[PDB]
Amino acid sequence: SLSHTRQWRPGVVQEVAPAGVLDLGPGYIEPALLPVRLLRGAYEQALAEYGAAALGYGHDPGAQPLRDRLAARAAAADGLPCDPDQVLLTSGTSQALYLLATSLAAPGDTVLTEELCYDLGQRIFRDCSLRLRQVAMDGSGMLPDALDRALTEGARAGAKTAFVYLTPTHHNPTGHTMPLARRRLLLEVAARHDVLIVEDDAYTELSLIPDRTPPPSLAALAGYRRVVRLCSFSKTLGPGLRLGWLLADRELAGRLATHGLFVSGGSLNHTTSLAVSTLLASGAYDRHLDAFRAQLRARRDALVGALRAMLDDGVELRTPEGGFFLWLRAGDGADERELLDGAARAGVRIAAGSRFGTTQGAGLRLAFSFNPPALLEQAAKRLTTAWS
Amino acid sequence: SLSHTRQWRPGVVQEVAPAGVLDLGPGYIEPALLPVRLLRGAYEQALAEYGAAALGYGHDPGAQPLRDRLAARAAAADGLPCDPDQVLLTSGTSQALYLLATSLAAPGDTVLTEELCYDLGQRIFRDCSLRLRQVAMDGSGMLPDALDRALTEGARAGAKTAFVYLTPTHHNPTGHTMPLARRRLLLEVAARHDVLIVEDDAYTELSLIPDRTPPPSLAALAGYRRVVRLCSFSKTLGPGLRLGWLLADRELAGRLATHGLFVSGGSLNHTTSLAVSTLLASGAYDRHLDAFRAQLRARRDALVGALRAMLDDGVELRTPEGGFFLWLRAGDGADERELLDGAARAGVRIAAGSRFGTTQGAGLRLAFSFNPPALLEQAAKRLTTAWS
């Protein structure tokens, strides 16, 4: 296989856990599952098909063939319209978050987030000199009354809210999916205060129950009024590609794409976008997603099945409908450090819930994306044994 | 055969001139000269060599093999040391300028530039809410006394200076190269005021006399104190790749690389960086550069030689030692619009000097990078006919 690990080493990849550690920490894709061979063929085809145009400056919002297909995919998933002029290619959601935090917000502005949300996203906002304020959540995500109060309070305090940051589908870290009714209630609150929502949908294509799909995006439900949606190829084809996209209404997408950043450099990742375009065009992307989702489902079920047969009675686990993560809620007198100590005795790396915000009791995030079923089962056995 | 133009069309590439126009406007690489076949092999080689590691998140400051080689190349060119921990990979200088304008500057800060400088760079700074202030220049670039006055007056007014932006080698648009003595004088002024210099060196590798190398960078001459240097593969391999790098002192490179942007997304363009790394490793990059510099030299010499008649007619032209551009100065009584109207009658697109700042009399930028010598000669003939 071309998905070998001979160069999966510090200094090449972002992080490698210490030797001997079964790594359920990061939401990385298992190396054997990364579609190296598919992307090799994609670059081969794209460079032949697009020729010199693959190496020239790209069309500023992104090559139109990819724009067109991404809009059509959004519309099909939402059941609601999406025009190509609403789409703007990015070099990854991390870069898109940086762009929004510096172009749709100014230093000192506040970003409202759920009590638990993406830790490195918070770090982007903080490092862009934005203030963070958490909002109470339940098993369906941000609570509408709590958001209403936070926006009302912020106003009276003179705290300008730049945007509300939400990951509504296959939430990082809890795995939950916000249902339609909650989505509408949060949009109503945001509209009343006329505050922008930034909807980070990195896991949207990773529903693990076949023939089930997430509810329509916040952006589509709002008719793209005062919502920007961020999507990425990181969790479907490979994070190293540094390619994603952004959906907004035509006016805002157009405004962003006329920034000097885009006029100076063109499409934010042109050559790679054409490679990925060839995969969408041929159906190979969807064939890959079907196989990958089936691989993730098997890993989810192996990890859930082992933990459930083995966990203590006080630990609660809600099977996620998709994405990369399980969320364990111990609560009670259970101590996060004590649980992490058990993970260390087990030789397993997991992610501490406190990284993501405030938990009711103790919470732990475990990834099932990075290891095969048998190793996940072994990690659950070891964790269970240590924790008993 | 792979550097074809069958997809060199609106919606794929950034811009295409109107039909029938000989395009000496943009500093684009002639499509036939873009090394499509070379990059195809590079992606094939990188994905086979690096395997799954080419599609995972990359090492945050950039894969070490590329860092190490870029540091060594800087050291060789400067004749002065550069360590790999001083190098950060970027997704192009446009992105790097955005990052610096929003991380090392805040809205309302001033950027000092030469009276003539990169127009789309100015647009990045303005769209990031920075104020621009032009500083007088001569044939060697920014004047030190003028920079000192600009900084001293800014300090008097409490106008925070974010940085001084300079392109010292094969300047866009004039083509000049700042000599060593002027580089040191500017560094002395900036050091006394403790202001950062952002040194944009997009054309540094494009000296068109095979034995000649530019002077050492401002950054190296300063010992990387209070200078950040930006480099790109746009002008050497292809702008669509969206790949460049940044050189700074270890402390600043390290601080930038711990930003949430890099922790969240890893290397800013991982897969493409590995393809390009394989070209550096084999010598193929340098062999390409030798051939491409020879092609540019032929184009420069063709265009310059053909403009002989105009120069003897009062138009002034200083032949550039490198880069992509010629700069014509028409003098007094010549009007830029009149000259542009003649270009229109000639069916030739050129770049108005007013795009870049304040000219002494009329100035025009002509690119020799985008067309073969015969077409450049025909454009010169038509221009001279229209202007006579």
Ligand SMILES: Cc1ncc(COP(=O)(O)O)c(CN)c1O
């Ligand atoms: C919610 C969320 N958004 C964004 C990202 C990263 O986005 P990208 O790889 O496209 O930069 C992650 C992966 N940790 C994530 O979990």
Ligand SMILES: Cc1ncc(COP(=O)(O)O)c(CN)c1O
């Ligand atoms: C001075 C200068 N800097 C940067 C760029 C563009 O940089 P990049 O393609 O790496 O984004 C150009 C191209 N016009 C330039 O002339």
